[PDB]
A paper describes a structure:
Copper-containing nitrite reductases (CuNIRs) catalyze transformation of nitrite to nitric oxide, which has impacts on geochemical, agricultural, and medical health fields. Each protomer contains one type 1 copper (T1Cu) and one type 2 copper (T2Cu) site. The Cys residue forms a peptide-bond bridge (Cys-His bridge) together with one of the His ligands at the T2Cu site to transfer the electron to the catalytic T2Cu site, which is coordinated by three His residues and an axial water molecule.
Since the GK-like conformer complicates the interpretation of the T2Cu site structure, we constructed [name]/[name] and [name]/[name]/[name] mutants. The structures of [name]/[name] without NO2- and [name]/[name]/[name] in complex with NO2- were determined at 0.96 and 0.99 Å resolution, respectively. As was expected, Asn98 does not exhibit the GK-like conformation in either of the [name]-containing mutants. However, NO2- again shows several coordination manners in the [name]/[name]/[name] structure, indicating that the GK-like conformation observed in the [name]/[name] mutant is not responsible for the multiple conformers of NO2-. The first conformation of NO2- in the [name]/[name]/[name] structure is the κ1-O mode that is observed in the native T2Cu site. This state shows a shorter distance to the side chain amide N atom of Asn98 (2.9 Å) than that in the neutron structure. Because the complete κ2-O,O bidentate mode is typical of the [name] mutants, the hydrogen bond with AspCAT is necessary for stabilization of the κ2-O,O mode.
Numbering used by the authors:
A (entry chain A), B (entry chain A), C (entry chain A): 16 to 315
Write the structure that this text describes.
């Protein structure tokens, strides 16, 4: 199922570009590009990506920022596009296709705090998402969260599925071959990984005994819901979609729809390694287990 | 899988009958009937229906109304019945079968505000729901919703699946062949459609730039959950099951169980066409995309 | 797929042992054992169990109790282990394997009120859960629930799936063969059953006309979410995961993730038999229907 013009194509990752251009305005430039990603050991997926990552690079803006977004399409033959769930926009004017070897710029406001999916909007959308064109944009709430002062350390996790390569029958009708977590960096030194079955097991996220950890999470799908759970703890506080008003306490497991987000916070009380799962254990068995290593110092 | 006595049967739609009979009492009369519905282009499903619609006709009552419900069974051979999720009733006395060519009347109160599924209760219930015997009853809250004064325009949407015709193995064990939206009229001039893959794409719901839209939504299944999302906006306010107390804000996507309802409200800020999806994109690809056309005047 | 050392093995159920050892400390002793369970009429599953029950025996503790848990592994060849979702623990030190014919003791606090899953933690966790090593621990809130004084009668229900026997391909990739409810006793005289397709239909839970019923519920999976609904009523109050803060009202149906819990309360207004379902009707058809028989006296 490899398009003739994609045979042998493996475009090197290109860094995300972002710069603030006013107190409430931010420029973002991404690419659409075709990049080989190792999704399981020995298994390469020639993914349709933003910037050579799948999920794509993390975007963080402030509530009330208007985003001036440019997509540079490096794919030699397939059009691509961008839909941010954070924004208010006209889909038929602002989420439109950018043709091969062209760029397009679109402007829209991020009025709402939270942890939002982004993805390509090009028909068939299922094909673009399943092939890798998904990601997260975080919109920071103007007044924070009521538990901000309690949080010691924070990371971003994203859940996605992988199917048989570019196979629309499988995408529509088949079980996922792999379900995976990735982490995207918020601060210098944080890991930045792609959706694969192994990296966050072999290179766990790090924390220190006694810390309260915040995770910004989103299940991008394309197709499955997620039963998000951290082994050995309970979520002290949960904010559905990352909106501070949607505040639950003491949850064992957080139900995420496809594209669903949350801010979750939990305390790690003892040294050890703590798995992070979707509790739909067929999906966990097919890759969706990450690890958090908790040490007396927070160092590995 | 077509029952001998249903071969060639296509009973014309019969209008819902409703009339208020007291300040807190309402008569409703439906039929059970066998009616051909075009669920995808060129694909007829000889559905088991209420009133020749699938999902069935919309019912709207007020909180505290007692419903005096009559079902007239026009099916020549299969018994049918009615279960309203809105009501408090004895299932074994009030949700019982009405035999072919007979009628039955049942009385029960709708004590709780919200957006409730209704469906046939006849064993096997899966068979009756999958073949088309589902619908929505809205119970209006005595004191409204706190955001009532902000809403400019409102519609009803229902999600359902379609399987291989009357195939209990497929109903139990197979993926849906189609997943679809329909709209049911609240006010004169609103569309009133059946669950199909195309009508709400070709004849979009209409709105005006700047409006706040309310949707009353229910995912009737039979089998899937729904990740309900409007492209190009964020839900300002969500009331789970349509109960005013269950109030979320700023949600990108609303997780609906099978039979789950909600009242969702969102603002459309720019002219254009806005898709409405379940974000489980396998289901969207198999039909579950509706459209909302937003114009400077609200006219098409 | 029957391990040689399990052929012909059917270890008799062993009672749960629990005793309070201080105002905030409780001893619990379970077994891991291999026991034949009739999951559907004529269908024996040689389950991997705690104490010869699947789901395992109910555990009830108070918020703030530290649990001193001993597992005695009676399996001749497979290691087993215990993970309580209620507790804060080091998974790599406290949820570790107990080898055949050995015991292990682990101590950890239950700081959070609610209705929590427990299950084996031994890799592959999917295999242990699917084969029967799941259950519920209830942690009673120090200050109760705000609706405690309204509740007349209470029971515990658990939902689980069963797959082809010890078949990891089916566990990962196949639909469940059966989906089932069981009830676990809270007070003397309550039923105590295993996850099967028939017992709670033939021997319904009992209640009296006019009562408000509380159910403590958990969907242990392993793989499916649950759309929990009681026919003929509406949930007056719902507490997600059994935490009193997570308070919804007037829900028709409660969405439970895999491992998700709730406390749900509803009123039965008329004599009759009331089905209890997951509204994902493929699962209901494959076993997941229990019954509640409501009489003028509450006696059968
Ligand atoms: O909490 N691990 O299923
Ligand atoms: O927001 N369309 O996936
Ligand atoms: O309420 N029985 O689907
Ligand atoms: Cu300013
Ligand atoms: Cu600019
Ligand atoms: Cu694309
Ligand atoms: Cu989207
Ligand atoms: Cu701290
Ligand atoms: Cu915790
Ligand atoms: Cu009155
Ligand atoms: Cu009457
Ligand atoms: Cu019917
Ligand atoms: Cu129902
Ligand atoms: Cu307005
Ligand atoms: Cu919006
Ligand atoms: Cu004390
Ligand atoms: Cu002790
Ligand atoms: Cu085990
Ligand atoms: Cu678990
Ligand atoms: Cu009472
Ligand atoms: Cu009720």
């Amino acid at each position: 199922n490899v398009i003739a013009a994609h045979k042998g194509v493996n475009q090197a990752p290109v860094p995300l570009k972002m710069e603030r251009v006013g107190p409430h305005d931010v420029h973002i430039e991404m690419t659409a590009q075709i990049t080989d990603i190792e999704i399981d050991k020995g298994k390469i997926y020639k993914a349709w990506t933003f910037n050579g990552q799948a999920p794509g690079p993390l975007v963080v803006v402030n509530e009330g920022d208007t985003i001036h977004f440019t997509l540079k399409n490096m794919d030699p033959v397939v059009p691509h596009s961008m839909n941010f769930h954070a924004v208010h926009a006209s889909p038929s004017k602002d989420f439109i296709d950018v043709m091969p070897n062209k760029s397009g710029t679109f402007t829209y406001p991020a009025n709402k705090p939270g942890v939002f999916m982004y993805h390509a909007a090009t028909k068939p959308v299922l094909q673009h998402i399943a092939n890798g064109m998904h990601g997260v944009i975080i919109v920071k709430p103007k007044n924070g969260y009521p538990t901000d002062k309690e949080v010691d350390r924070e990371y971003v996790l994203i859940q996605n599925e992988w199917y048989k390569y570019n196979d629309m029958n499988d995408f529509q009708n088949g079980v996922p071959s792999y379900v995976v977590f990735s982490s995207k960096a918020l601060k210098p030194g944080d890991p930045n990984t792609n959706g694969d079955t192994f990296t966050l097991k072999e290179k766990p996220l790090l924390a220190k005994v006694g810390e309260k950890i915040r995770l910004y999470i989103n299940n991008v799908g394309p197709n499955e819901v997620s039963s998000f759970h951290v082994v050995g703890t309970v979520f002290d506080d949960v904010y559905l979609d990352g909106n501070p008003n949607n505040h639950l306490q003491g949850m064992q497991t957080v139900m995420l729809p496809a594209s669903g987000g949350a801010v979750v916070e939990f305390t790690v009380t003892r040294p050890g390694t703590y798995p992070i799962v979707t509790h739909q254990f067929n999906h966990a068995q097919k890759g969706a287990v990450a690890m958090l290593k908790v040490t007396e110092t927070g160092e590995d």
